[PDB]
Amino acid sequence: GSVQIVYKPVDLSKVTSKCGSLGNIHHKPGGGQVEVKSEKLDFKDRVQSKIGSLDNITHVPGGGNKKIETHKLTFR
Amino acid sequence: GSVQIVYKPVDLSKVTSKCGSLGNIHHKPGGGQVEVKSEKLDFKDRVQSKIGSLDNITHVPGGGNKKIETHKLTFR
Amino acid sequence: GSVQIVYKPVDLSKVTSKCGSLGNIHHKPGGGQVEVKSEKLDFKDRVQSKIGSLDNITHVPGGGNKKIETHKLTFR
Amino acid sequence: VQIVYKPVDLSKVTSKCGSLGNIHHKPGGGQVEVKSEKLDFKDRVQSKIGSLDNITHVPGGGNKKIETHKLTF
Amino acid sequence: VQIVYKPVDLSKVTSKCGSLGNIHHKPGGGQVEVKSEKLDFKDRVQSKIGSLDNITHVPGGGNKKIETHKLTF
Amino acid sequence: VQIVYKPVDLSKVTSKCGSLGNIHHKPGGGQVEVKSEKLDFKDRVQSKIGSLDNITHVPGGGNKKIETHKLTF
Amino acid sequence: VQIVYKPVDLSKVTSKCGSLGNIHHKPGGGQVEVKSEKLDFKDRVQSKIGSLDNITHVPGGGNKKIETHKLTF
Amino acid sequence: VQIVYKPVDLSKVTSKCGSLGNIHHKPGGGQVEVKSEKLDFKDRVQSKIGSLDNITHVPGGGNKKIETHKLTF
Amino acid sequence: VQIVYKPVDLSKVTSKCGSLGNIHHKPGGGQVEVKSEKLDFKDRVQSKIGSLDNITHVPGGGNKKIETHKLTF
Amino acid sequence: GSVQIVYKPVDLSKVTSKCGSLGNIHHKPGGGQVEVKSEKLDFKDRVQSKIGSLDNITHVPGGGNKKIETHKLTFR
Amino acid sequence: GSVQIVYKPVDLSKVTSKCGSLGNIHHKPGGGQVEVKSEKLDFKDRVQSKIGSLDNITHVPGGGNKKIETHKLTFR
Amino acid sequence: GSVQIVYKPVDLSKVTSKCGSLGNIHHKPGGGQVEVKSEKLDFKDRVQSKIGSLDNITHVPGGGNKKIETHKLTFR
């Protein structure tokens, strides 16, 4: 029959960090020697060809203190 | 039949970082040597060819204290 | 049939970073030596080709404390 | 005949020398005391009381590179 | 005839010397005391009381890279 | 006839030498006391009271790399 | 008849009481340190840091003298 | 008849109490340190760090001199 | 007939009581250190760190002298 | 015969004191009871009669560093 | 016969006191009781009679660093 | 016969007192009780008579650094 829903999440969260110093972080990758020989390079569908490339990320957050909080409610 | 929905999500949160110093963060990738030989290069659909590239991200936020919150409610 | 919806999400939050100093953040990639050879190059749809390219991002926000809050409500 | 003289050099030569990358989180903080009726210093006396003296000499650290790409027919 | 002279050098040559990468988290913090009627120092005396000295010398640390690449028919 | 002279060098030549990578978590913290009527130093005296004096000399550490890629028909 | 009533009193009555005649040559001279992120005092807390607190209560020390020089014929 | 009533009193009556005549030559001189994230004091706490306190009480030290000197023929 | 009533009193009545005549040459001079995340005091705590707290209570020490020099013929 | 006298005293004297404090010096003498009975006091020559007297000196020099230096020379 | 007298007494002297403080110097003598009875007091020559006197000197010099020097020379 | 007298006494002297403070110097004598009795008192030459007398001296010089130098010379 009749419906009552009471939905009262209550959060008191301290998500913290207290870092004194981040030092001389060095990021220095090096590619060497790469060679490809062929009659064809022949790439059909969704091919990733990455020959001698470098992908480099230097992420240095002074705090990275991520919070995710997802809610839902449903009725029919 | 009646419906009552009372939806009072409460948050109190501290999402912090008391970072004292970020130092001499150095990012210096080096590409080396790369050499590709063929009669054809032939790329048809969604091909990513990266020969000898560098992709370089240097992300240094004094705080990256990311909060995501998400809500939904649905009725029929 | 009667419907009462009361929708009062509360947040009080401190999403902060008391960062003392950002140092000598250096970003210096170097592309090296690249060689590509063919009788033909033939690229069709959604092809990417990144021969010897540099992409560089240098992102240094004094705070990057991204908050997202998303809400929805729905009825039929 | 052909001669195809194509040497490749991608070398790196480096001298990281002195005081480098050291962290030094909070040196000091201790009490130091001297009490006297006389202090008397008179010839090439070096005196330090509670100092945090960082000092560095690098008369070295030098780099040398020589290459001689000679070719002759 | 052909001669294809293509040496490749990808060397790293490094000197890494003196004081490097040391953390030194919270040196000091200890009480030091000296008490007298006289302190009296008179020829080439080195005196240190409580000091957090870090003196460093590097007369060395050299690098020498030498190459010759002669070809002749 | 052909001569394909293609030496490849990937060498790492290194001198890591001195004081390296040490952690040094909380050096010190201990009491020191000296009491007198006189202290008296008069020719080449070295005197230390509660100091945490770190010191490093590197007159060595040199690198030499030599190559003679000679070719002759 | 004669009565020669001549009592002599040269008495001294004294209360030397409290802190008296103490010399106190150079109290103090020592380092004192407190370090924290929080200090929190909230009900009848008495706190002293390096103080040289001399204090003295003398609700006593009182003197009483009674004499009754009665004579009767 | 004669009565020669001449009592003599040369008494000294003394209370000498609390802290008296003490020399206290150079109290202190020693390093004291306290280190924390929190100090937290909440009901009738007495805290002392390095203090050269000298608190003194004298509720006592009283003197009472009573005399009667009756004569009768 | 005669009565020569001449009592002589030379008495010394004394209460020397408390802390008296002590020399106390150089009390202290020693290191003290405390390290924590928390100190937490919550009901009638007495806490002392390196203090040289001298203290003295004298509720006693009283003097009473009573005399009844009665004469009768 | 002929006379030469050379009289060269040479004095470099430090007579010192370095007193930090002189305390609560008390001087309190007390005479008691004294009685003399006689037919005569009869004093003829250089008599000192000192009956029940007090002679009191309270000398407290902050330094009392006395020097005496007496010289003479003579010829006939 | 000739006479030569050369009389060069030299003094250099420091006759000092670095006194920090002179305290509560108290001088309080008390005469008691004194009683002299006779048919005569009869004092003839150089008699000193002191009955019940007090002589009281309170000398408190911040320095009493007395120097006496004395010289003589004599010839006939 | 020839006489040469050369008379050069030299002094350089510091006769000092760096007195920091003179305190509560108290001088309080008290004469008590004295009784003298005779049929006669008879005093002749150079008699002194000091019955119940107080002599008091209170001498507190900030410095009393008395120097005497006395010289003489004589010939016949």
Side-chain angles (χ1 to χ4, degrees), chain F residues 10-66:
Chain F
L10 310 179
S11 300
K12 56 188 173 185
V13 183
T14 78
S15 291
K16 298 190 181 188
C17 55
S19 174
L20 315 175
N22 303 281
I23 291 186
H24 291 95
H25 183 278
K26 306 194 301 189
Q31 292 68 38
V32 180
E33 179 173 330
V34 182
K35 182 179 177 180
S36 197
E37 299 181 359
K38 185 186 299 185
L39 308 184
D40 178 353
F41 306 154
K42 71 185 295 182
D43 176 17
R44 291 168 287 162
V45 175
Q46 187 175 47
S47 181
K48 303 183 191 189
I49 300 173
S51 64
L52 315 185
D53 47 307
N54 290 80
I55 174 168
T56 290
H57 301 69
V58 187
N63 297 286
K64 301 173 60 173
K65 177 76 170 184
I66 298 98

Side-chain angles (χ1 to χ4, degrees), chain D residues 26 29-33 35, chain G residues 26 29-33 35:
Chain D
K26 305 197 300 189
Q31 289 64 35
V32 181
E33 179 170 329
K35 183 175 179 178
Chain G
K26 305 197 300 189
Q31 289 64 35
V32 181
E33 179 170 329
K35 183 175 179 178

